[PDB]
Design a protein around this motif. Structure first.
Motif, PDB file in Angstrom:
ATOM      1  N   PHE A   7       0.800  -1.214   0.000  1.00 20.25           N
ATOM      2  CA  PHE A   7       0.000   0.000   0.000  1.00 20.25           C
ATOM      3  C   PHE A   7       0.842   1.276   0.000  1.00 20.25           C
ATOM      4  CE2 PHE A   7      -3.993  -1.918   0.328  1.00 20.25           C
ATOM      5  CZ  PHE A   7      -3.966  -2.941   1.253  1.00 20.25           C
ATOM      6  N   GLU A   8       0.398   2.248  -0.765  1.00 21.77           N
ATOM      7  CA  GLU A   8       1.069   3.543  -0.830  1.00 21.77           C
ATOM      8  C   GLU A   8       0.869   4.242   0.518  1.00 21.77           C
ATOM      9  OE1 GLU A   8       0.695   7.257  -3.763  1.00 21.77           O
ATOM     10  OE2 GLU A   8       0.710   5.393  -4.903  1.00 21.77           O
ATOM     11  N   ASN A  10       0.741   7.489   3.121  1.00 20.42           N
ATOM     12  CA  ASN A  10       0.247   8.863   2.954  1.00 20.42           C
ATOM     13  C   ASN A  10      -0.878   8.993   1.942  1.00 20.42           C
ATOM     14  OD1 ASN A  10       2.483   9.382   4.707  1.00 20.42           O
ATOM     15  ND2 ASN A  10       3.790  10.049   3.035  1.00 20.42           N
ATOM     16  N   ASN A  11      -1.799   8.039   1.936  1.00 21.53           N
ATOM     17  CA  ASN A  11      -2.949   8.011   1.033  1.00 21.53           C
ATOM     18  C   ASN A  11      -4.007   8.974   1.590  1.00 21.53           C
ATOM     19  OD1 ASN A  11      -5.338   7.244  -0.197  1.00 21.53           O
ATOM     20  ND2 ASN A  11      -4.752   5.039  -0.142  1.00 21.53           N
ATOM     21  N   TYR A  13      -7.065   9.409   0.850  1.00 21.48           N
ATOM     22  CA  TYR A  13      -8.370   8.798   1.082  1.00 21.48           C
ATOM     23  C   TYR A  13      -8.497   8.114   2.410  1.00 21.48           C
ATOM     24  CZ  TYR A  13      -8.883  10.049  -3.781  1.00 21.48           C
ATOM     25  OH  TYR A  13      -8.987  10.760  -4.941  1.00 21.48           O
ATOM     26  N   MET A  14      -7.426   7.873   3.186  1.00 19.49           N
ATOM     27  CA  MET A  14      -7.507   7.213   4.467  1.00 19.49           C
ATOM     28  C   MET A  14      -8.379   8.004   5.454  1.00 19.49           C
ATOM     29  SD  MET A  14      -6.257   4.050   4.675  1.00 19.49           S
ATOM     30  CE  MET A  14      -6.478   4.150   6.561  1.00 19.49           C
ATOM     31  N   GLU A  34      -6.152   8.113  -9.083  1.00 15.12           N
ATOM     32  CA  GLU A  34      -6.925   8.471  -7.878  1.00 15.12           C
ATOM     33  C   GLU A  34      -7.864   7.345  -7.479  1.00 15.12           C
ATOM     34  OE1 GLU A  34      -6.591  11.118  -5.907  1.00 15.12           O
ATOM     35  OE2 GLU A  34      -4.919  11.683  -7.175  1.00 15.12           O
ATOM     36  N   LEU A  37      -5.916   4.768  -5.544  1.00 10.34           N
ATOM     37  CA  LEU A  37      -5.700   5.173  -4.162  1.00 10.34           C
ATOM     38  C   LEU A  37      -6.940   5.051  -3.279  1.00 10.34           C
ATOM     39  CD1 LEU A  37      -3.378   8.240  -4.731  1.00 10.34           C
ATOM     40  CD2 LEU A  37      -2.759   6.040  -3.737  1.00 10.34           C
ATOM     41  N   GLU A  40      -7.340   1.440  -2.512  1.00 10.29           N
ATOM     42  CA  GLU A  40      -6.344   0.984  -1.542  1.00 10.29           C
ATOM     43  C   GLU A  40      -6.808   1.361  -0.116  1.00 10.29           C
ATOM     44  OE1 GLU A  40      -2.214   1.938  -2.104  1.00 10.29           O
ATOM     45  OE2 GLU A  40      -2.210   1.219  -4.155  1.00 10.29           O
ATOM     46  N   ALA A  41      -7.367   2.557   0.031  1.00 12.14           N
ATOM     47  CA  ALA A  41      -7.895   2.978   1.326  1.00 12.14           C
ATOM     48  C   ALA A  41      -9.005   2.074   1.814  1.00 12.14           C
ATOM     49  CB  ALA A  41      -8.403   4.421   1.283  1.00 12.14           C
TER      50      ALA A  41
END
Ligand SMILES: [Mg+2]
Length: 112
Positions: A7-8, A10-11, A13-14, A34, A37, A40-41
């Motif tokens: 996982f990236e 500093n996302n 969308y978290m 986007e 991301l 992923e969140a």
């Protein structure tokens, strides 16, 4: 394969309330990085949500990142082994990755 997705950090969308819905809206609009991301969140917030993993995988395949697509799709398959869209998507991304890598190897042979 591997279901351990990188996982990236500093996302953004978290800290959003409904990143699944934003992901689906951005994917439909072709804003793929986007959307990926946002999904992923969802996968980090709700790790057992198979549709989040499948959407992340399909978005990554559409954004030409078949290696990441395969890890997310493998995770989806573990959650719902009977999802045959995921089965077909895994076969498509493996073929996509192989073809892209062969194209690059051909071009590097010509250029170098
Ligand atoms: Mg492609």
């Amino acid at each position: 394969n591997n279901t351990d997705y990188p996982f990236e950090a500093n996302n953004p969308y978290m800290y959003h309330e409904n990143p699944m819905e934003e992901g689906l809206s951005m994917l439909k609009l072709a804003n793929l990085a986007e959307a990926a991301l946002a999904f992923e969140a969802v996968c980090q917030k709700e790790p057992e949500r198979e549709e989040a993993w499948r959407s992340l995988g399909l978005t990554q395949a559409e954004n030409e990142k078949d290696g990441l697509a395969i890890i997310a799709l493998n995770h989806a398959r573990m959650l719902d082994p009977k999802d045959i869209a995921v089965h077909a998507a895994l076969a498509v991304s493996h073929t996509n990755e192989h073809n892209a890598n062969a194209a690059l190897a051909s071009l590097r042979a010509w250029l170098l």
